[PDB]
Design an enzyme around this catalytic site. Structure first.
Site, PDB file in Angstrom:
ATOM      1  N   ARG A  63       0.820  -1.226   0.000  1.00 26.17           N
ATOM      2  CA  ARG A  63       0.000   0.000   0.000  1.00 26.17           C
ATOM      3  C   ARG A  63       0.849   1.269   0.000  1.00 26.17           C
ATOM      4  O   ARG A  63       0.474   2.289  -0.622  1.00 26.17           O
ATOM      5  CB  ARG A  63      -1.002   0.004   1.176  1.00 26.17           C
ATOM      6  N   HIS A 123       0.329   4.295  -2.650  1.00 23.80           N
ATOM      7  CA  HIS A 123      -0.046   5.643  -2.257  1.00 23.80           C
ATOM      8  C   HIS A 123       1.034   6.672  -2.586  1.00 23.80           C
ATOM      9  O   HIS A 123       0.712   7.843  -2.857  1.00 23.80           O
ATOM     10  CB  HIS A 123      -0.400   5.641  -0.776  1.00 23.80           C
ATOM     11  N   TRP A 167     -10.295  -8.999   3.525  1.00 18.57           N
ATOM     12  CA  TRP A 167     -11.043  -9.333   2.325  1.00 18.57           C
ATOM     13  C   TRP A 167     -11.073 -10.840   2.086  1.00 18.57           C
ATOM     14  O   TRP A 167     -11.862 -11.341   1.238  1.00 18.57           O
ATOM     15  CB  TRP A 167     -10.424  -8.621   1.145  1.00 18.57           C
TER      16      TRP A 167
HETATM   17  C1  HEM Z   1     -10.678   2.799  -5.655  1.00 20.26           C
HETATM   18  C2  HEM Z   1      -9.383   2.480  -5.180  1.00 20.26           C
HETATM   19  C3  HEM Z   1      -9.029   2.074  -3.839  1.00 20.26           C
HETATM   20  C4  HEM Z   1      -9.618   2.412  -2.662  1.00 20.26           C
HETATM   21  C5  HEM Z   1     -10.801   3.332  -2.401  1.00 20.26           C
HETATM   22  C6  HEM Z   1      -8.899   1.758  -1.612  1.00 20.26           C
HETATM   23  C7  HEM Z   1      -9.181   1.838  -0.253  1.00 20.26           C
HETATM   24  C8  HEM Z   1      -8.544   1.115   0.772  1.00 20.26           C
HETATM   25  C9  HEM Z   1      -8.883   1.235   2.178  1.00 20.26           C
HETATM   26  C10 HEM Z   1     -10.003   2.070   2.784  1.00 20.26           C
HETATM   27  C11 HEM Z   1      -7.973   0.424   2.824  1.00 20.26           C
HETATM   28  C12 HEM Z   1      -7.906   0.093   4.296  1.00 20.26           C
HETATM   29  C13 HEM Z   1      -6.883   0.999   5.000  1.00 20.26           C
HETATM   30  C14 HEM Z   1      -6.853   0.603   6.469  1.00 20.26           C
HETATM   31  O1  HEM Z   1      -7.899   0.751   7.192  1.00 20.26           O
HETATM   32  O2  HEM Z   1      -5.783   0.109   6.910  1.00 20.26           O
HETATM   33  C15 HEM Z   1      -7.107  -0.187   1.857  1.00 20.26           C
HETATM   34  C16 HEM Z   1      -6.118  -1.102   2.167  1.00 20.26           C
HETATM   35  C17 HEM Z   1      -5.208  -1.605   1.212  1.00 20.26           C
HETATM   36  N1  HEM Z   1      -5.172  -1.239  -0.112  1.00 20.26           N
HETATM   37 FE1  HEM Z   1      -6.459  -0.087  -1.120  1.00 20.26          FE
HETATM   38  N2  HEM Z   1      -7.826   1.030  -2.140  1.00 20.26           N
HETATM   39  C18 HEM Z   1      -7.875   1.212  -3.511  1.00 20.26           C
HETATM   40  C19 HEM Z   1      -6.933   0.766  -4.420  1.00 20.26           C
HETATM   41  C20 HEM Z   1      -5.788   0.010  -4.104  1.00 20.26           C
HETATM   42  C21 HEM Z   1      -4.747  -0.331  -5.044  1.00 20.26           C
HETATM   43  C22 HEM Z   1      -4.777   0.218  -6.466  1.00 20.26           C
HETATM   44  C23 HEM Z   1      -3.795  -1.020  -4.362  1.00 20.26           C
HETATM   45  C24 HEM Z   1      -2.485  -1.474  -4.786  1.00 20.26           C
HETATM   46  C25 HEM Z   1      -2.254  -2.047  -6.034  1.00 20.26           C
HETATM   47  C26 HEM Z   1      -4.247  -1.134  -2.998  1.00 20.26           C
HETATM   48  C27 HEM Z   1      -3.635  -1.857  -1.987  1.00 20.26           C
HETATM   49  C28 HEM Z   1      -4.076  -1.944  -0.640  1.00 20.26           C
HETATM   50  C29 HEM Z   1      -3.503  -2.813   0.378  1.00 20.26           C
HETATM   51  C30 HEM Z   1      -2.354  -3.770   0.089  1.00 20.26           C
HETATM   52  C31 HEM Z   1      -4.211  -2.620   1.519  1.00 20.26           C
HETATM   53  C32 HEM Z   1      -4.037  -3.274   2.879  1.00 20.26           C
HETATM   54  C33 HEM Z   1      -3.133  -2.431   3.792  1.00 20.26           C
HETATM   55  C34 HEM Z   1      -2.884  -3.052   5.158  1.00 20.26           C
HETATM   56  O3  HEM Z   1      -3.281  -4.199   5.474  1.00 20.26           O
HETATM   57  O4  HEM Z   1      -2.218  -2.346   5.994  1.00 20.26           O
HETATM   58  N3  HEM Z   1      -5.488  -0.467  -2.833  1.00 20.26           N
HETATM   59  N4  HEM Z   1      -7.465   0.265   0.588  1.00 20.26           N
END
Ligand code: HEM
Length: 291
Positions: free
Chosen positions: A45, A49, A188
């Site tokens: 992530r 970002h 997920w």
């Molecule tokens: C419409 C696009 C996206 C939205 C709105 C979104 C939103 C989110 C949100 C709300 C979280 C949870 C953050 C937390 O509470 O720790 C998250 C986690 C994450 N996202 Fe996204 N995301 C998007 C696209 C992506 C993309 C493009 C990638 C990378 C290719 C990505 C990789 C991740 C990963 C790996 C996590 C888990 C982080 C953790 O466990 O600490 N996301 N995302």
């Protein structure tokens, strides 16, 4: 403004494989983080970002300048929790002070995907640190409470098409949502530190219910204990996205290949590579090296 890749002086593939390896060894060692999920997901992530602030219209933001190190960007509400990935990388940067910040944040993501048994991601060096006043403002990363039209329009700014968006979203197999961070809670799926196509399978095959979480936000929940954000669920509400979700749920190799391309592209947006730059590097995993 043009951002030309500039190879860290005198460095070659073996130097960057040593950085890869140090990241990968710390990923293995620091296994307790996040209830034994480990740092893989938050490093993926962080890479996204730090790249996803890019604007194709004027080449502002992007991975090149490593601007997350400045307080306006590390304190973006959208980046809550990523400080854990930054702290992980600190001893890495201390050991290898010659690597640029953008090169280290993006390499962390590559290394995490590969060590989690994901596809190989070709990676190019040459990001150069830029000054504090080049840090993009907050608000360029996406909202999670929106629909497919939002997602599609959002990603046009990153020059991503429907296939690229659905492929990139497959990274949500990894890690979890944390209520105090984003206002969403839960993983997920079951395999959340191994890179697989589980995100697509769960979207299609679980029985989802629209519920409110303890932060009063709506999310989709299953009896297995999994969740989807509204933007995740939009991928099966929109018929164009739905077709692609089904493709990846039914072909792990295709998902791997398309993810690899899209993720490299994301990490490279905004960067001009001279004609005589090195070819992209493909790092060996620890397992492939016998380490
Ligand atoms: C419409 C696009 C996206 C939205 C709105 C979104 C939103 C989110 C949100 C709300 C979280 C949870 C953050 C937390 O509470 O720790 C998250 C986690 C994450 N996202 Fe996204 N995301 C998007 C696209 C992506 C993309 C493009 C990638 C990378 C290719 C990505 C990789 C991740 C990963 C790996 C996590 C888990 C982080 C953790 O466990 O600490 N996301 N995302």
């Amino acid at each position: 403004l043009v951002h030309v890749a500039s190879v860290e002086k005198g460095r070659s593939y073996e130097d960057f494989q040593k950085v890869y390896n140090a990241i990968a060894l710390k990923l293995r060692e620091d296994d307790e983080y996040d209830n034994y999920i480990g740092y893989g997901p938050v490093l993926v992530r962080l890479a996204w970002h730090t790249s996803g602030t890019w604007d194709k219209h004027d080449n502002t933001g992007g991975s090149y300048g490593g601007t997350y190190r400045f307080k306006k960007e590390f304190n973006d509400p959208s980046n809550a929790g990523l400080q854990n990935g930054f702290k992980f990388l600190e001893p890495i940067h201390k050991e290898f002070p010659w690597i640029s910040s953008g090169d280290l944040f993006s390499l962390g993501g590559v290394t995490a995907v590969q060590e989690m048994q994901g596809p190989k991601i070709p990676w190019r060096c040459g990001r150069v640190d830029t000054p504090e006043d080049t840090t993009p403002d907050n608000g360029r990363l996406p909202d999670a409470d929106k629909d497919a039209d939002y997602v599609r329009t959002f990603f046009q700014r990153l020059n991503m098409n429907d296939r690229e968006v659905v492929a990139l979203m497959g990274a949500h197999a990894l890690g979890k949502t944390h209520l105090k961070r984003s206002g969403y809670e839960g993983p997920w799926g079951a395999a959340n530190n191994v890179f697989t196509n589980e995100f697509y399978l769960n979207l299609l095959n679980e029985d989802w219910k629209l519920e409110k979480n303890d932060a009063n936000n709506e999310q989709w929940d299953s009896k297995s204990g999994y969740m989807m954000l509204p933007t995740d669920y939009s991928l099966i509400q929109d018929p164009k996205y739905l077709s692609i979700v089904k493709e990846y749920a039914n072909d792990q190799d295709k998902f791997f290949k398309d993810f690899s391309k899209a993720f490299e592209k994301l990490l490279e947006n905004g960067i001009t590579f001279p004609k005589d730059a090195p070819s992209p590097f493909i790092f060996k995993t620890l397992e492939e090296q016998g380490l």
